[PDB]
Design a protein around this ligand. Structure first.
Ligand SMILES: CN1C(=O)Cn2c1nc1nc(N3CCC[C@@H](N)C3)n(Cc3cc(F)ccc3C#N)c1c2=O
Ligand SMILES: CN1C(=O)Cn2c1nc1nc(N3CCC[C@@H](N)C3)n(Cc3cc(F)ccc3C#N)c1c2=O
Ligand SMILES: *[C@@H]1O[C@H](CO)[C@@H](O[C@@H]2O[C@H](CO)[C@@H](O)[C@H](O)[C@H]2NC(C)=O)[C@H](O)[C@H]1NC(C)=O
Ligand SMILES: *[C@@H]1O[C@H](CO)[C@@H](O[C@@H]2O[C@H](CO)[C@@H](O)[C@H](O)[C@H]2NC(C)=O)[C@H](O)[C@H]1NC(C)=O
Ligand SMILES: *[C@@H]1O[C@H](CO)[C@@H](O[C@@H]2O[C@H](CO)[C@@H](O)[C@H](O)[C@H]2NC(C)=O)[C@H](O)[C@H]1NC(C)=O
Ligand SMILES: *[C@@H]1O[C@H](CO)[C@@H](O[C@@H]2O[C@H](CO)[C@@H](O)[C@H](O)[C@H]2NC(C)=O)[C@H](O)[C@H]1NC(C)=O
Ligand SMILES: *[C@@H]1O[C@H](CO)[C@@H](O[C@@H]2O[C@H](CO)[C@@H](O)[C@H](O)[C@H]2NC(C)=O)[C@H](O)[C@H]1NC(C)=O
Ligand SMILES: *[C@@H]1O[C@H](CO)[C@@H](O[C@@H]2O[C@H](CO)[C@@H](O)[C@H](O)[C@H]2NC(C)=O)[C@H](O)[C@H]1NC(C)=O
Ligand SMILES: *[C@@H]1O[C@H](CO)[C@@H](O[C@@H]2O[C@H](CO)[C@@H](O)[C@H](O)[C@H]2NC(C)=O)[C@H](O)[C@H]1NC(C)=O
Ligand SMILES: *[C@@H]1O[C@H](CO)[C@@H](O[C@@H]2O[C@H](CO)[C@@H](O)[C@H](O)[C@H]2NC(C)=O)[C@H](O)[C@H]1NC(C)=O
Ligand SMILES: *[C@@H]1O[C@H](CO)[C@@H](O[C@@H]2O[C@H](CO)[C@@H](O)[C@H](O)[C@H]2NC(C)=O)[C@H](O)[C@H]1NC(C)=O
Ligand SMILES: *C1O[C@H](CO)[C@@H](O)[C@H](O)[C@H]1NC(C)=O
Ligand SMILES: *[C@@H]1O[C@H](CO)[C@@H](O)[C@H](O)[C@H]1NC(C)=O
Ligand SMILES: *[C@@H]1O[C@H](CO)[C@@H](O)[C@H](O)[C@H]1NC(C)=O
Ligand SMILES: *[C@@H]1O[C@H](CO)[C@@H](O)[C@H](O)[C@H]1NC(C)=O
Ligand code: NA
Lengths: 728, 728
């Protein structure tokens, strides 16, 4: 008999997905790391040359975390002494190696504890942030020019984001934007002076006698937010004798009237920059289009070139207003916006006209704009077969919008229904990356006639290994609630028999714009539960879920902890009535927003669920960050939405946990969903005399991702689920 | 069939022990509370009168936490707005009520947030501490005189102890001592400037948006300790001088050479004070006897009156050097000291002679000196029947040491083997308080003839209730190890049958000078476990235990986590050898030092124990406080005892926890054993891949004593023990 996919297989990564991560360096060539060597490939023919031998830094004396080759291929930035901070932020030490003179640069080195570094988009200039200040190097061996002098730890951030902008706005630590040819360097400055600090203990190694208190400027819902300023510096006119002059671009009057955010920065041309600003009440945004004035050295943003984006049903954008995609001349742009039917489609704008023209339409949505030429726009959408959980690449003829061609739909329809893409510099070639329902498949293509050049990686090695394993299957289908179709997925045990009753685990996210029912192939904890333990692992996308239009997505506006919680209960109620589900054995689990929903479900008094697990859950919206929380909830003030903030807590449902088995887990060094959130759940459960299971993870953050904690958490939860389901 | 003593009986206090708490106000009268009325009793005849009617303060507008009548019976101090701090410390509001005028004093009120308040021992003066400074009021309605101006929160403490002196030295928040007739006020001043702070989050009510960081000056083992100074002020000079001088009494040269502590303050006469000082290396103490010099207004401590107390085998005293009991003229004193055979006995000293005379002797110990008259000294000891866990009151004739009468031994020898005593002001009467083996019994006696006057409380109501319950029994006996008797106790299930095999739970303290084998009657968790669950709950006093001589007590000197841990393992082996124990069902539990020992035992690899529970355990000696830890361990330095501090951690035994089922519990706001201690245990277990059960208690301290958390912890532990023993 053949083996099953075990908990150890998941924890030890016995079955590995192969990748094909390339970096385009031009319109015809890409870099690829093979056996620690860096190769250059010609996309047309597939031939290669060694760019950098692995042995070049054998005597370096430090372990190199990462490499970054300058756009001109003349230099390599060597990253070492990496120290993680938050999701994207970290510090590191850097060395520059000259590829032509085959030597490490020892003069005017980038300092240790550097926070961010980036090459210019063309050539080899560098911009870096150190001690919260921006520096520019024109040549790697030459002295830096100091750009800002105001940088101050936890207070003034120049060219780097603070906690909330990193996590919730830019999904990045960098707040630097080079102009297309590198003449100008645009940057944001954040001021956290009056932002309150979250404080928590960090225990460190056993040798530390007194715990350390970590203090992070973090605005909770309704608290004082950081303030922002935007500047542009000309890097071609820097002096060794004089301090660099930064030109400020101020936010429009419609933003300055109150609290706001800088939400997007996109260069249009060598002398034109676009910025989007968002009000703290996130249903109103404005784009400014700013032009460099050669005579005055100023940046002017004409009122006639402003573009307003607003929502009457919810917030603006999926998580923020979308990025514009400018034409070669920068006189017009393409941008994803919600249409009159509430579906996200591509609109074509003129820089000086209010009305835009929709180029795509239908009861489906564009996911992202991927490439633009004078003749075609390339995008990813879930149009194909009306499946919101599938993704394909399309091209639209700009001279005729009726001519839309799917480029990935028919390549391999049984294996591939979820794609992402990477285009070369001027869209001459594209790499397609299929991630499911079958094994990932990486292919290379030429745009002229959409030729499928070659297979880069087909995962045939893993397919051979998986033939000897009793793997689970995945069912993707829908249920109908009040005339609307809502999709679900079921990870089904091997040899699934509809005449047998299986225990069911509801795997939850259910946050705004979440999607848990899709065609992606995954090897995770659910694979083991279905394969070894014979548990069905179900996921459901109800009200508030994404990629299906605003009628569904905005249904939870100002009302978190309502419809999305009721919809998970309803889906389980419907699954419990199916012939193959044991109604005495239904469980629920989730992490983050999924942990909040699991806890709200377990406290609903529904009687559908026997047990459940919440990992790092939100418990009360006033404890979570301003940017994410307020986007959906507004402000927690009597005049705004305080009553709903107060009635949507987990703590108020404590008495209802009397009839369920609950396991509550949280890392003590969680900078994102503070340990406080679970500390308040446990205190409420103790207050009403409800017994429950708990586990804290010393010094672990939101990810509970260290090798040992990751193995321990999944081992602990597996014991809990098996005990709940009476499985030996 | 009779009911058993259930978990709810314990948690809801269904069977209540009646007490008889009296307050002596003179040599022949006491105060007692009966149905919220304060009654005054005549000791000689037993007749009473209403001292203060329960309706007196119905219109006060505040709930009165406690009261204190002035020694002269003229005023009553009313304590309200009580806010608990540590084990003894708290703040409160105070009002003074004039008992003659039958009116509340409205002028010159004691301020809100007062830290400590005490009447003078005679009359009605008051000394109080507010904002870390001392104040004196000569009359209740008159202005206060400020004594100190150096008070500073967390830095300078005048007349109150810092964290460590409160918990480990004085067992009190108060650091002020009135002279016998109230002329002088003596006080200590603590300086915590360089003492490091323990920092931890406090979550508070769910309404609190950001957690608070609690910061406490707390010296961990080997850290910078608070420094101390001692002063005496003449309170009779206050109304005559603008700013009365606080005269300092400096520690002797033998103490000033290094770190030291002030460990005892005892007034001998109106003009003679005794002070005991202890070196940071707690095996050397010095008593100074200081006299007021009327011509200079100074206090002088004659070197001829100095008394040295040292130990070659361990530390000095059980937990600190004992207090002296001065004869009326203050020319001689009685003090409990370890004799040449290592047994604690009463020694008689002349103030200016170095050699003392032992007045008691034998292989047993004096527990405490209770009263001293011109003819007799009264003391408690464990002499009776050679039982170290028994306590009786004895009377020794001062003019003939061969005349020693046991006052309590034969009163009710079957019911009463553990006594404490409360003497009237000049020892004319005494209340005896029997706490076991039978139900507690409170009796009143006349000292003139040692006759029993009456039974104050016999718990007859509870005796009647318990007749309908299948109560457990208690066995107190000993085992011989290496020719030494070691005492143990067992809580035996009802209808105990020696032919059956019972599951056993080892209930541990086992810290230096601990005693878990005694004659006290208790209604606790063990009562439920034996009665309802049929578990034997055993406790053992091994090496390091108290009240049996220094050979046993000092056996663990500089070696915590060695013999006392081994002796608990050996006790379980010996209990198995008895034939009524299921060797497959042996568990172990403890709180504080008992949690450390439980954890050391579970990590020993002995194979003896199936499971265990550690509640708020010490895990590493460097995390615990300097005073307690260093008394037994010395300093954590390479020159001193660092090697043993590093060898005696719970964390180093993590790998062995793979052989057991462990439950780890800790309150997050534990100021005593920091949550850090269990956070380091859990991280070490996660690091070696050991599964275990955990429970944190939000905002609970070392006692986990709030009504809800107390019920929650015992319910959670009961499920764990029952699961480990396969009990339905
Ligand atoms: C896979 N997954 C789940 O299963 C549940 N879940 C998951 N991913 C997620 N990514 C996100 N963010 C979306 C906005 C930008 C960035 N903050 C990442 N959130 C939101 C989120 C919601 C919350 F209330 C508490 C913490 C987080 C967090 N973090 C989730 C999430 O809740
Ligand atoms: C009933 N009981 C047990 O069962 C286990 N236990 C118990 N009482 C106790 N009282 C004490 N102190 C004695 C010195 C003065 C004062 N600090 C109280 N300690 C010592 C103790 C030792 C330790 F390592 C961690 C915390 C404590 C604490 N606190 C215990 C104890 O350990
Ligand atoms: C891939 O193959 C082509 C030839 O088919 C190479 O193009 C040549 O470039 C090299 C040096 O870079 C010269 O020796 C030839 O004269 C070139 N021929 C043509 C037709 O351009 C190319 O270098 C190869 N690419 C890689 C990345 O190895
Ligand atoms: C980055 O850190 C290293 C280590 O602190 C610095 O390296 C030098 O190397 C040794 C120790 O490894 C020291 O004796 C010197 O004081 C260091 N300084 C110099 C100037 O050589 C290194 O200088 C730091 N790099 C930068 C760019 O500041
Ligand atoms: C960062 O923002 C703060 C305001 O949060 C600016 O500081 C001053 O703010 C205080 C209130 O905290 C006012 O008293 C002052 O009028 C403000 N200005 C000055 C010049 O003192 C602070 O200047 C900002 N820093 C930067 C570099 O922008
Ligand atoms: C990138 O673009 C900038 C801005 O368009 C170019 O700078 C201009 O160049 C011409 C010289 O050919 C001058 O007339 C202008 O005064 C420059 N403007 C500024 C603002 O400096 C620049 O040449 C380009 N750089 C590269 C490397 O192509
Ligand atoms: C943005 O959202 C806000 C909050 O829902 C909307 O606010 C209106 O103004 C106040 C809030 O201070 C309420 O009294 C009204 O009920 C709101 N009007 C409604 C719900 O129609 C605001 O209208 C929104 N902006 C847009 C452009 O829709
Ligand atoms: C207990 O009883 C005694 C004696 O009956 C009371 O003693 C006092 O005796 C005198 C006789 O001269 C009576 O006139 C008084 O009633 C008593 N004095 C006072 C001040 O009350 C005694 O007081 C009683 N004690 C209590 C506490 O009620
Ligand atoms: C408490 O102790 C601190 C030292 O731990 C004393 O502070 C020093 O005071 C002197 C003045 O005599 C200064 O010159 C030092 O710089 C101080 N040191 C520190 C670390 O603060 C303090 O005076 C003592 N306070 C009292 C009231 O005794
Ligand atoms: C009462 O006397 C004390 C002792 O001299 C005074 O305390 C001094 O106060 C001054 C500053 O006002 C400092 O020079 C000294 O360091 C203090 N010494 C001590 C021991 O505190 C005190 O201020 C006096 N109070 C009044 C009202 O005069
Ligand atoms: C309480 O004791 C103090 C100290 O002995 C007494 O004060 C002394 O009184 C005598 C008179 O007998 C004088 O010789 C001294 O000058 C006093 N000394 C001081 C320091 O004040 C006090 O009188 C006694 N008080 C009462 C009320 O008996
Ligand atoms: C005072 O005691 C209680 C209230 O606590 C009440 O039952 C009683 O009537 C009162 N007075 C007397 C004299 O018992
Ligand atoms: C540049 O600005 C900084 C910060 O104000 C100043 O201290 C420094 O001296 C300046 N250098 C020149 C060359 O102006
Ligand atoms: C204590 O606080 C209350 C409430 O603010 C106030 O009315 C009262 O005057 C205070 N008492 C004293 C003695 O300061
Ligand atoms: C006190 O303890 C230290 C450390 O054990 C020791 O070196 C010293 O001699 C001791 N004092 C006595 C009287 O034994
Ligand atoms: Na091909």
């Amino acid at each position: 008999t053949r083996k099953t996919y075990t908990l150890t297989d998941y924890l030890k990564n016995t079955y590995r997905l192969k990748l094909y991560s390339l970096r385009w360096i031009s319109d015809h060539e890409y870099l690829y790391k093979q056996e620690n060597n860096i190769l250059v490939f010609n996309a047309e023919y597939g031939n290669s040359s060694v760019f950098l031998e692995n042995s070049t830094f054998d005597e370096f004396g430090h372990s190199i975390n990462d490499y970054s080759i300058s756009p001109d291929g003349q230099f390599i930035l060597l990253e070492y002494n990496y120290v993680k901070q938050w999701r994207h932020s970290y510090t590191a030490s850097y060395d520059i190696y000259d590829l032509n003179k085959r030597q490490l640069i020892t003069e005017e080195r980038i300092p240790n504890n550097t926070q961010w570094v980036t090459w210019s988009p063309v050539g080899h200039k560098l911009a870096y942030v150190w001690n919260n200040d921006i520096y520019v190097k024109i040549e790697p061996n030459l002295p830096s020019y100091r750009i800002t002098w105001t940088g101050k730890e936890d207070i003034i951030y120049n060219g780097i984001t603070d906690w909330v902008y990193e996590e919730e706005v830019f999904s990045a630590y960098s707040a630097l934007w080079w102009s297309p040819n590198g003449t100008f360097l645009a940057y944001a400055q954040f001021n956290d002076t009056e932002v309150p600090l979250i404080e928590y203990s960090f225990y460190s190694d056993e040798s530390l006698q007194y715990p350390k208190t970590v203090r992070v400027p973090y605005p909770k819902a309704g608290a004082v937010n950081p303030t922002v300023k935007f500047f542009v510096v000309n890097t071609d006119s820097l002096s060794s004798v004089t301090n660099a002059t930064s030109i400020q671009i101020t936010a429009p009057a419609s933003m300055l009237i109150g609290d706001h955010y800088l939400c997007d920065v996109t260069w249009a041309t060598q002398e034109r920059i676009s910025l989007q600003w968002l009000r703290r009440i996130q249903n109103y945004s404005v784009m400014d289009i700013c032009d460099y004035d050669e005579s005055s050295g100023r940046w002017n943003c004409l009122v006639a070139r402003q573009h307003i984006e607003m929502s009457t049903t919810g917030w603006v954008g999926r998580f923020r207003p979308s990025e514009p995609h400018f034409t070669l001349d920068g006189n017009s742009f393409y941008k994803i916006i919600s249409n009159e039917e509430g579906y996200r489609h591509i609109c074509y704008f003129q820089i000086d006209k209010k009305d835009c023209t929709f180029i795509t339409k239908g009861t489906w949505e564009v996911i992202g704009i991927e490439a633009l030429t004078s003749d075609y726009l390339y995008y990813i959408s879930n149009e194909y077969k009306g499946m919101p959980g599938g993704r394909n690449l399309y091209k639209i003829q700009l001279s005729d919008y009726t001519k839309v061609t799917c480029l990935s739909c028919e390549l391999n329809p049984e294996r591939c229904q979820y794609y992402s893409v990477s285009f070369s510099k001027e869209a001459k070639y594209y790499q397609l990356r299929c991630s499911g329902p079958g094994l990932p498949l990486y292919t290379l293509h030429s745009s002229v006639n959409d030729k499928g050049l070659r297979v880069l990686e087909d995962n045939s090695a893993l397919d051979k290994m998986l033939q000897n394993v009793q793997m689970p299957s995945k069912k993707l289908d829908f249920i109908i609630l009040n005339e609307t179709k809502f999709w679900y997925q079921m990870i089904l045990p091997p040899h699934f028999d509809k005449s047998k009753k299986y225990p069911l685990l509801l795997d939850v996210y259910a946050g705004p714009c979440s999607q848990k029912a899709d065609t992606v192939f995954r090897l995770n904890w659910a694979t083991y539960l279905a394969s070894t333990e014979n548990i069905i692992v179900a996921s459901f996308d109800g009200r508030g879920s994404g990629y299906q239009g605003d009628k569904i997505m905005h249904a939870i506006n100002r009302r978190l902890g309502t419809f999305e919680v009721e919809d998970q209960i309803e889906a389980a109620r419907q699954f419990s009535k199916m012939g193959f589900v044991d109604n005495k054995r239904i469980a629920i689990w989730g992490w983050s927003y999924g942990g909040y929903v699991t806890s709200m479900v377990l406290g609903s008094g529904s009687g559908v669920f026997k047990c459940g697990i919440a990992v790092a859950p939100v418990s009360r919206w006033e404890y979570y960050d301003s940017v994410y929380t307020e986007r959906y909830m507004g402000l927690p003030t009597p005049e705004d939405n305080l009553d709903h903030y107060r009635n949507s807590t987990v703590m108020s449902r404590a008495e209802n946990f009397k009839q369920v088995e609950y396991l509550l887990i949280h890392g003590t060094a969680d900078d994102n969903v503070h340990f406080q959130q679970s500390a308040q759940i446990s205190k409420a459960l103790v207050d009403v005399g409800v017994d429950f299971q708990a586990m804290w993870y010393t010094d672990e953050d939101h990810g509970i991702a260290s090798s040992t904690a990751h193995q321990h958490i999944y081992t602990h939860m597996s014991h809990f689920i098996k005990q709940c389901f009476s499985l030996p």
